[PDB]
Design an enzyme around this catalytic site. Structure first.
Site, PDB file in Angstrom:
ATOM      1  N   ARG A  88       0.802  -1.213   0.000  1.00 13.29           N
ATOM      2  CA  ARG A  88       0.000   0.000   0.000  1.00 13.29           C
ATOM      3  C   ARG A  88       0.837   1.267   0.000  1.00 13.29           C
ATOM      4  O   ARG A  88       1.885   1.334   0.640  1.00 13.29           O
ATOM      5  CB  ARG A  88      -0.937   0.025   1.212  1.00 13.29           C
ATOM      6  N   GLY A  89       0.364   2.264  -0.737  1.00 11.26           N
ATOM      7  CA  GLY A  89       1.041   3.543  -0.793  1.00 11.26           C
ATOM      8  C   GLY A  89       0.117   4.544  -0.127  1.00 11.26           C
ATOM      9  O   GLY A  89      -0.664   4.177   0.754  1.00 11.26           O
ATOM     10  N   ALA A  90       0.190   5.799  -0.546  1.00 10.92           N
ATOM     11  CA  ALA A  90      -0.668   6.829   0.020  1.00 10.92           C
ATOM     12  C   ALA A  90      -1.999   6.891  -0.724  1.00 10.92           C
ATOM     13  O   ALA A  90      -3.047   7.109  -0.116  1.00 10.92           O
ATOM     14  CB  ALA A  90       0.026   8.182  -0.049  1.00 10.92           C
ATOM     15  N   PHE A  91      -1.959   6.685  -2.038  1.00 17.61           N
ATOM     16  CA  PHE A  91      -3.169   6.769  -2.848  1.00 17.61           C
ATOM     17  C   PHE A  91      -3.542   5.480  -3.562  1.00 17.61           C
ATOM     18  O   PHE A  91      -4.648   5.355  -4.085  1.00 17.61           O
ATOM     19  CB  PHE A  91      -3.018   7.880  -3.885  1.00 17.61           C
ATOM     20  N   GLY A  92      -2.622   4.524  -3.586  1.00 18.07           N
ATOM     21  CA  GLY A  92      -2.897   3.272  -4.265  1.00 18.07           C
ATOM     22  C   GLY A  92      -2.558   2.063  -3.421  1.00 18.07           C
ATOM     23  O   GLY A  92      -1.929   2.178  -2.370  1.00 18.07           O
TER      24      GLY A  92
ATOM     25  N   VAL B 100      -2.300  -2.656  -3.631  1.00 19.77           N
ATOM     26  CA  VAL B 100      -2.441  -3.913  -4.348  1.00 19.77           C
ATOM     27  C   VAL B 100      -2.998  -4.868  -3.310  1.00 19.77           C
ATOM     28  O   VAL B 100      -2.463  -4.972  -2.202  1.00 19.77           O
ATOM     29  CB  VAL B 100      -1.100  -4.460  -4.858  1.00 19.77           C
TER      30      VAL B 100
ATOM     31  N   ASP C 147      11.719   3.316 -13.582  1.00 21.78           N
ATOM     32  CA  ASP C 147      11.912   3.075 -12.149  1.00 21.78           C
ATOM     33  C   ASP C 147      12.319   1.620 -11.941  1.00 21.78           C
ATOM     34  O   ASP C 147      11.804   0.932 -11.056  1.00 21.78           O
ATOM     35  CB  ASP C 147      10.631   3.374 -11.359  1.00 21.78           C
TER      36      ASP C 147
ATOM     37  N   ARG D  77      12.972  -3.648  -6.174  1.00 23.79           N
ATOM     38  CA  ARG D  77      11.686  -3.463  -5.509  1.00 23.79           C
ATOM     39  C   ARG D  77      10.548  -3.515  -6.522  1.00 23.79           C
ATOM     40  O   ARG D  77       9.388  -3.703  -6.148  1.00 23.79           O
ATOM     41  CB  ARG D  77      11.645  -2.129  -4.752  1.00 23.79           C
ATOM     42  N   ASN D  78      10.882  -3.350  -7.800  1.00 27.01           N
ATOM     43  CA  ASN D  78       9.878  -3.405  -8.853  1.00 27.01           C
ATOM     44  C   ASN D  78       9.986  -4.667  -9.698  1.00 27.01           C
ATOM     45  O   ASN D  78       9.634  -4.674 -10.876  1.00 27.01           O
ATOM     46  CB  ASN D  78       9.942  -2.161  -9.744  1.00 27.01           C
TER      47      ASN D  78
ATOM     48  N   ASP E  30       5.665  -2.247 -11.881  1.00 26.56           N
ATOM     49  CA  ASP E  30       5.859  -0.879 -11.420  1.00 26.56           C
ATOM     50  C   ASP E  30       4.773  -0.651 -10.376  1.00 26.56           C
ATOM     51  O   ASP E  30       3.598  -0.502 -10.717  1.00 26.56           O
ATOM     52  CB  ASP E  30       5.713   0.116 -12.580  1.00 26.56           C
TER      53      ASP E  30
HETATM   54  C1  LIG Z   1       2.597  -6.482  -4.389  1.00 25.37           C
HETATM   55  N1  LIG Z   1       2.462  -7.831  -4.953  1.00 25.37           N
HETATM   56  C2  LIG Z   1       2.719  -9.001  -4.316  1.00 25.37           C
HETATM   57  C3  LIG Z   1       2.487 -10.084  -5.130  1.00 25.37           C
HETATM   58  C4  LIG Z   1       2.059  -9.568  -6.350  1.00 25.37           C
HETATM   59  N2  LIG Z   1       1.714 -10.312  -7.502  1.00 25.37           N
HETATM   60  C5  LIG Z   1       1.323  -9.497  -8.618  1.00 25.37           C
HETATM   61  N3  LIG Z   1       1.299  -8.085  -8.534  1.00 25.37           N
HETATM   62  C6  LIG Z   1       1.657  -7.420  -7.338  1.00 25.37           C
HETATM   63  O1  LIG Z   1       1.609  -6.027  -7.213  1.00 25.37           O
HETATM   64  C7  LIG Z   1       1.528  -5.307  -8.416  1.00 25.37           C
HETATM   65  C8  LIG Z   1       2.649  -4.475  -8.814  1.00 25.37           C
HETATM   66  C9  LIG Z   1       2.545  -3.625  -9.962  1.00 25.37           C
HETATM   67  C10 LIG Z   1       1.314  -3.616 -10.718  1.00 25.37           C
HETATM   68  N4  LIG Z   1       1.175  -2.801 -11.799  1.00 25.37           N
HETATM   69  C11 LIG Z   1       2.146  -2.684 -12.720  1.00 25.37           C
HETATM   70  O2  LIG Z   1       3.182  -3.352 -12.689  1.00 25.37           O
HETATM   71  N5  LIG Z   1       1.863  -1.749 -13.696  1.00 25.37           N
HETATM   72  C12 LIG Z   1       2.746  -1.349 -14.690  1.00 25.37           C
HETATM   73  C13 LIG Z   1       2.505  -0.082 -15.359  1.00 25.37           C
HETATM   74  C14 LIG Z   1       3.359   0.371 -16.430  1.00 25.37           C
HETATM   75  C15 LIG Z   1       4.464  -0.437 -16.840  1.00 25.37           C
HETATM   76  C16 LIG Z   1       4.735  -1.718 -16.179  1.00 25.37           C
HETATM   77  C17 LIG Z   1       5.954  -2.576 -16.612  1.00 25.37           C
HETATM   78  F1  LIG Z   1       5.495  -3.703 -17.102  1.00 25.37           F
HETATM   79  F2  LIG Z   1       6.632  -1.921 -17.519  1.00 25.37           F
HETATM   80  F3  LIG Z   1       6.702  -2.792 -15.542  1.00 25.37           F
HETATM   81  C18 LIG Z   1       3.862  -2.175 -15.094  1.00 25.37           C
HETATM   82  C19 LIG Z   1       0.213  -4.452 -10.319  1.00 25.37           C
HETATM   83  F4  LIG Z   1      -0.886  -4.377 -11.073  1.00 25.37           F
HETATM   84  C20 LIG Z   1       0.294  -5.293  -9.191  1.00 25.37           C
HETATM   85  C21 LIG Z   1       2.042  -8.157  -6.251  1.00 25.37           C
END
Ligand SMILES: Cn1ccc2ncnc(Oc3ccc(NC(=O)Nc4cccc(C(F)(F)F)c4)c(F)c3)c21
Length: 303
Positions: free
Chosen positions: A32-36, A38, A164, A168-169, A182
């Site tokens: 969890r962040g401030a506005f979003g 998962v 980014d 962590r990502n 991300d």
């Molecule tokens: C926290 N966490 C723990 C297990 C877990 N499994 C799936 N997603 C998670 O969290 C997410 C992380 C990021 C995104 N979104 C995301 O990655 N978007 C994004 C947006 C633009 C570009 C890209 C990238 F593909 F370029 F990285 C990703 C999500 F939906 C769920 C999980």
């Protein structure tokens, strides 16, 4: 026009992606962040007829406004554009109908972010190997590195930039598969140590041209990839140990200062890190070249 900077013009085909909110059983938060945030959830038949599947749902939370709502829709559109690849977070569906929150549903990666995971395996690592059944090894680390390169090469092929890239990502799923992601708003950068006031930026992962010129390109992502490699081969350590991340740090980076080899690296992997940290963006290897190189190192490790 840029595919990920001007994503508002991208399509959202509801007939293909829309998933009924009543077929989603929301569970505990994964981040969890401030506005979003998962949240973990159980989706009924989202990817296989009549089959329950654990998924991750990215959505907003208290504090968010219409601007974050618009941002989340753009994220959905860009994920659809990027498409599927084994090493990129996999979009499964979305809930966009009025009456409820906008939800982006992706495949669940059981082990969470790679930085936290690797840091938790310090006592379960051996370079080469029943007692070591679930131990990580050099093969694992090189394989993760190779996979992220594959994911980034794919992302580049979709004409997108990450901006980014860091451990962590990166998410770790079952079968040692890692996926680029991300967290964005699902992490509060104004309260996270990895982001510094410069405006909160991930300075320790940024290429010189990004810090001083605000330039973001796939080659600046390569620099970040180098820092990610250091994180992997230090098993989740924080970059630039004991260094104050201020103006002097940035100047020294420009001058040529680089991190020393991490504890678990191989000589080849450290040289790859240094290559990714070339001062000239054009002199850094491309992700396609990194895929080739890392693939060879992975194969060599098995020898
Ligand atoms: C926290 N966490 C723990 C297990 C877990 N499994 C799936 N997603 C998670 O969290 C997410 C992380 C990021 C995104 N979104 C995301 O990655 N978007 C994004 C947006 C633009 C570009 C890209 C990238 F593909 F370029 F990285 C990703 C999500 F939906 C769920 C999980």
């Amino acid at each position: 026009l840029p595919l990920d900077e001007h994503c508002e013009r991208l399509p959202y085909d509801a007939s293909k992606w829309e998933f009924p909110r009543d077929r989603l059983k929301l569970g505990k938060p994964l981040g969890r962040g401030a506005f979003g945030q998962v949240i973990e959830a159980d989706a009924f038949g989202i990817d296989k007829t009549a089959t329950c599947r654990t998924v991750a749902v990215k959505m907003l939370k208290e504090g968010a406004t219409h601007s974050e709502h618009r941002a989340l829709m753009s994220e959905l559109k860009i994920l659809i554009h990027i498409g599927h690849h084994l090493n990129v977070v996999n979009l499964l569906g979305a809930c966009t109908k009025p009456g409820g929150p906008l939800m982006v549903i992706v495949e669940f990666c059981k082990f969470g972010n790679l930085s936290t995971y690797l840091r938790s395996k310090r006592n379960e690592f051996v370079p080469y190997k029943d007692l070591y059944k679930d131990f990580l090894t050099l093969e694992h680390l090189i394989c993760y590195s190779f996979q992220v390169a594959k994911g980034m090469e794919f992302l580049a092929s979709r004409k997108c930039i990450h901006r980014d890239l860091a451990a962590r990502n990166i998410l770790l799923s079952e079968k040692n598969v890692v996926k680029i992601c991300d967290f964005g708003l699902a992490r509060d950068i104004y309260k996270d140590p990895d982001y510094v006031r410069k405006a909160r930026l991930p300075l320790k992962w940024m290429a010189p041209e990004t810090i001083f010129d605000r330039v973001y390109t796939i080659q600046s992502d390569v620099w970040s990839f180098g820092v990610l490699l250091w994180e992997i081969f230090s098993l989740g350590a924080s970059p630039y140990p004991g260094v104050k991340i201020d103006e002097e740090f940035c100047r020294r980076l420009k001058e040529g200062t680089r991190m020393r080899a991490p504890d678990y690296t191989t000589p080849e992997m450290y040289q790859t890190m240094l290559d990714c940290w070339h001062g000239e963006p054009s002199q850094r290897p491309t992700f396609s070249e990194l895929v080739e190189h890392l693939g060879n190192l992975l194969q060599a490790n098995a020898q």
